[PDB]
Amino acid sequence: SLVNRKQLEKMANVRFRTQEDEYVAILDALEEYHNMSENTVVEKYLKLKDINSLTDIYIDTYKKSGRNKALKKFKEYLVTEVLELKNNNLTPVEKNLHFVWIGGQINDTAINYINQWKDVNSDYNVNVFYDSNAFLINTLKKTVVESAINDTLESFRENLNDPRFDYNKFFRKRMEIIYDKQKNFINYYKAQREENPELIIDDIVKTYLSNEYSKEIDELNTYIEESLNKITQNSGNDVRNFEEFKNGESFNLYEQELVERWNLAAASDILRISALKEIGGMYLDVDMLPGIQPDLFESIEKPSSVTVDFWEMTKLEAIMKYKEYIPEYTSEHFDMLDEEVQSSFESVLASKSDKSEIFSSLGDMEASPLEVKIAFNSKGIINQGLISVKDSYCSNLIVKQIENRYKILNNSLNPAISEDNDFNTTTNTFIDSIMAEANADNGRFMMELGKYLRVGFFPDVKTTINLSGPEAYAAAYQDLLMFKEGSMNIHLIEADLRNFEISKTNISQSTEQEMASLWSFDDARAKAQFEEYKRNYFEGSLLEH
Ligand SMILES: O=c1ccn([C@@H]2O[C@H](COP(=O)(O)OP(=O)(O)O)[C@@H](O)[C@H]2O)c(=O)[nH]1
Ligand SMILES: OC[C@H]1CNC[C@@H](O)[C@@H]1O
Ligand SMILES: [Mn+2]
């Protein structure tokens, strides 16, 4: 229990000192809190917030006060009490599974993963969010990148056999051309905006494609129709019918990522938290699988020399080898084990006739009205799994974190874009604005933003995580525990974040599709892509008329 008024009066006592008005305000607010049995969890949190605010006013007003040490201890007690309020007052989570697949047709691989969740959660309504207006974004991005690859290989043909023209130099020159093609597209998009705003994204994208890359609108229309038909058959839920999201102050950010940046991961980041806030339930990336029954492989000991990641992937690969639930699932880890260990997996699985004996169900989940729970890995929290009741306090804090992060980004980036200059010029203008605008609080967040323009086009560019992804979640949890909004300087450690984490039992994260990121790539994949592009040029395109 949080200290009562008598107990704080004892802690912050200063003999023969008159009670300041600001001090009595804290004592009155504390006493009111202890008499809020009839009130909601959010009302109780907002009272604690008020008490923390009144305590900060006292400390800021009377800088040298003898009460200040005890009041700073009381501030620690308020944080502890928020955690007790969070952990002790749970309400049911709406039985909704939310997935997002935007920007193009959904692959059978995504559907096969989604179907594993449906099969062991018969009691759950499933939404696969898609955007009926933007099925051609993945096609636009692929077209433009392929064009920029060809133009780079052509322009630097003479240098391609030179090892000093490495993968890094290739991606730098390609980015110059990609930025000009993206600038050409957005200067086109916003010119066309102010002709017929009753044209959907796919309509304007078809004219860019079947103008300047000579694509067949017959086949593009077929692609849209097959995409709409397929998603409609697989629990499709259209973003364009989600009115609170369309009307809200994050929709412009969604459309920025979807249409200007072609970052479907960032767009999914913005949409998923609005789906949780507005509907409640559990969000999952399409590369996530249900938790494995915790004791399924209890009888098989992990080899000492092998990583946790190797062992978790081998368990899913064993399931898919012998039960074949997901066709064409890799066995690349499982195949590294000798016949003895392989046979132990086979004999464990040979005695199970139903998927419910392999994969666990979510069942009846509960969470705090205050919180959003987040998945985690050895590197920290990750928003590939989220649980929230409808209109949770944290869902609102996360939306506002994302909005504030985009406010700061766009304030420095958008001037540069609008000055019709090339990639490197735009980059330096942007970076100069960042270093000029940086302050003590937000400084560290700034400087994580410098590579924003490169997201999806360069190896090891992860800016999305700092804007719409995990950092926004950590900052929202800091907002909740520090009774404020707009935390930019994150000091939470894993002990703090552990209170907001989804149990490992509720998600299998170590899947085949999880190892293949759709919006980022590492140096090894970059080197291999560069070798692939030179091969397809020298042995393919160069030899053609
Ligand atoms: O063309 C795409 C690519 C990505 N995504 C969304 O972005 C999420 C994150 O993708 P990914 O798992 O590649 O990100 P990572 O786990 O590598 O950070 C996916 O689950 C989708 O909801 C999408 O909707 N369409
Ligand atoms: O924030 C970008 C991405 C980070 N990795 C997990 C994904 O769900 C997310 O979109
Ligand atoms: Mn993933």
Numbering used by the authors: 2 to 546
Excerpt from the publication:
TcdA and TcdB contain domains that use UDP-glucose to glucosylate and inactivate host Rho GTPases, resulting in cytoskeletal changes causing cell rounding and loss of intestinal integrity. The GTD domains of TcdA and TcdB catalyze transfer of a glucosyl residue to a nucleophilic threonine acceptor in Rho GTPases.
The geometry of UDP, isofagomine and noeuromycin bound to TcdB-GTD was established by solving the crystal structures. The binding of UDP and isofagomine is well resolved in the binding pocket. The uracil ring is π-π stacked with Trp102 and sandwiched between the side chains of Trp102 and Leu265. The α and β phosphates of UDP also interact with structural waters and coordinate to the Mn2+ metal cation, which is in turn coordinated to the carboxyl groups of Asp288 and Glu515. The cationic nitrogen of isofagomine is 2.6 Å from O of the β-phosphate of UDP in an ion-pair interaction. A structural water molecule is 2.7 Å on the opposite face of the isofagomine cation in appropriate position to act as the attacking nucleophile for the hydrolytic reaction of TcdB with UDP-glucose. O3 of isofagomine is hydrogen bonded with the carboxylate of Asp286 and the Arg273 guanidinium. The O4 and O6 of the isofagomine share H-bond interactions with both carboxylate oxygens of Asp270. Movement of the loop from residues Gln510 to Asp523 (10 Å) towards the binding pocket occurs on inhibitor binding and is highlighted with the black arrow. The entropic contribution for isofagomine and noeuromycin binding was –TΔS = 0.5 ± 0.2 kcal/mol and -TΔS = 4.2 ± 0.3 kcal/mol, respectively. Larger enthalpic contributions of isofagomine binding to TcdB-GTD in the presence of UDP is consistent with the Ki values presented in Table 2, making isofagomine the more potent inhibitor.
